[PDB]
Amino acid sequence: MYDWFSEMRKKDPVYYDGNIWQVFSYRYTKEVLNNFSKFSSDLTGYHERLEDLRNGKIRFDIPTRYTMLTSDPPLHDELRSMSADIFSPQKLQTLETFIRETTRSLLDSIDPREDDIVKKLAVPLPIIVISKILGLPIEDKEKFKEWSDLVAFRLGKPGEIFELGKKYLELIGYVKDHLNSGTEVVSRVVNSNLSDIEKLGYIILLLIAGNETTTNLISNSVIDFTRFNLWQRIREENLYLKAIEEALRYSPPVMRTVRKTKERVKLGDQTIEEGEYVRVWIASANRDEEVFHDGEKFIPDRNPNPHLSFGSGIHLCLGAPLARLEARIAIEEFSKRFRHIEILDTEKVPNEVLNGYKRLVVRLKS
Ligand code: HEM
Numbered sequence: 001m002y003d004w005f006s007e008m009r010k011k012d013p014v015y016y017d018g019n020i021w022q023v024f025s026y027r028y029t030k031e032v033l034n035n036f037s038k039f040s041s042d043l044t045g046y047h048e049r050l051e052d053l054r055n056g057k058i059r060f061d062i063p064t065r066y067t068m069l070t071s072d073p074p075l076h077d078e079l080r081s082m083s084a085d086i087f088s089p090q091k092l093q094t095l096e097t098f099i100r101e102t103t104r105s106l107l108d109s110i111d112p113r114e115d116d117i118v119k120k121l122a123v124p125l126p127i128i129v130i131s132k133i134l135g136l137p138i139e140d141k142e143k144f145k146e147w148s149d150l151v152a153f154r155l156g157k158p159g160e161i162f163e164l165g166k167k168y169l170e171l172i173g174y175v176k177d178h179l180n181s182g183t184e185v186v187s188r189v190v191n192s193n194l195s196d197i198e199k200l201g202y203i204i205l206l207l208i209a210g211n212e213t214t215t216n217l218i219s220n221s222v223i224d225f226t227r228f229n230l231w232q233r234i235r236e237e238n239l240y241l242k243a244i245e246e247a248l249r250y251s252p253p254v255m256r257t258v259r260k261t262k263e264r265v266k267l268g269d270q271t272i273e274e275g276e277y278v279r280v281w282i283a284s285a286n287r288d289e290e291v292f293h294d295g296e297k298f299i300p301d302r303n304p305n306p307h308l309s310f311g312s313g314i315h316l317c318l319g320a321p322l323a324r325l326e327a328r329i330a331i332e333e334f335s336k337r338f339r340h341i342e343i344l345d346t347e348k349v350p351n352e353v354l355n356g357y358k359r360l361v362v363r364l365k366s
Helices: 002-011 026-034 046-053 075-083 089-108 117-122 124-134 138-150 161-178 184-190 196-208 211-227 231-237 240-250 320-335
Strands: 014-016 021-023 257-261 265-267 270-272 277-280 340-348 357-365
Touching: 014 270, 021 026, 026 257, 026 265, 026 277, 046 075, 075 184, 075 196, 089 117, 089 124, 089 320, 117 124, 117 211, 117 320, 117 357, 124 138, 124 184, 124 196, 124 211, 124 320, 138 161, 138 196, 138 211, 161 196, 184 196, 211 231, 211 240, 211 320, 211 340, 211 357, 231 320, 240 320
Parallel strands: 021 277
Antiparallel strands: 014 021, 257 277, 265 270, 340 357
């Protein structure tokens, strides 16, 4: 649907189709994302229940409705400041050896003749890394794999209520079980003025917000580098940093995000009424010809590359530096292991927001 995106960017960058508003151009998607006053992220009733949560009036509820992702400032900033430096440059420098050793370990498990790199590399890496950072027992990776499906970007589908109930029951129980054995990261959260439900929500967000997305970055990168035959060049010219950024732009793990109008507002030539949902197409903005010359092409050394794959504004992905580091080390170590790669079989996740692969079977020549 990238051709439909281009047509919309040209004729209706801000389009109303009866029920929701949709934005396709780079200029307007960025404007929406940055104007948090007009375009709110308070879509889960968080602000409305903050008083009763902090009072202990609400005792039970789905914890994932109360995270920094579904909040506007000042609440949003009060929450985010508790972990603003979790992925600081110094912290990541120190994690480099652990991340590199971990992917080398995962690569060691790959059978060159024919293996699934999503299963052996892309899925485990982010999970193992976040577990170390949070101080949660890696010995529960498989469970973590299951719970990663709960990431907020994923919308509902019929017949999942029982399955989801099971995961929530286990996940919540696990977090409550390890709230006081985590790193300073979780300690600061557990020792704040937040209600119990919010603490749960906060820890779950940090635990699952980047698993499927980071996995998708690695998978999408492997697919793009292979299909456009760039492995040789990337190693040769050391285009890892720029190439991964071009994968993020071209094959964004998250296709779009949503906002709700906080009052009548004019975006472009349109006046969006108060209380309307606005779908922001990150994938389309990333192809905007005005901002990305030859945007329909995968240019490995494209520079600069101001894509919106991690968002923009106050909710700009907290894990961006980590995701970038993990993916880079993954792709570097992988490239150093094979002389030729061949994609034998793939299976794509069936979702309109999360963009990635469920299976990626390849054959490698070490
Ligand atoms: C390549 C992988 C990733 C992609 C493409 C991705 C994408 C995003 C996007 C689009 C947003 C903004 C959502 C919005 O504006 O409504 C976001 C927010 C967030 N992401 Fe990521 N993410 C990735 C990896 C990670 C990782 C590794 C973590 C670490 C736990 C993480 C933690 C978060 C958090 C906590 C937020 C909310 C921040 C806030 O609301 O201020 N993400 N992510």
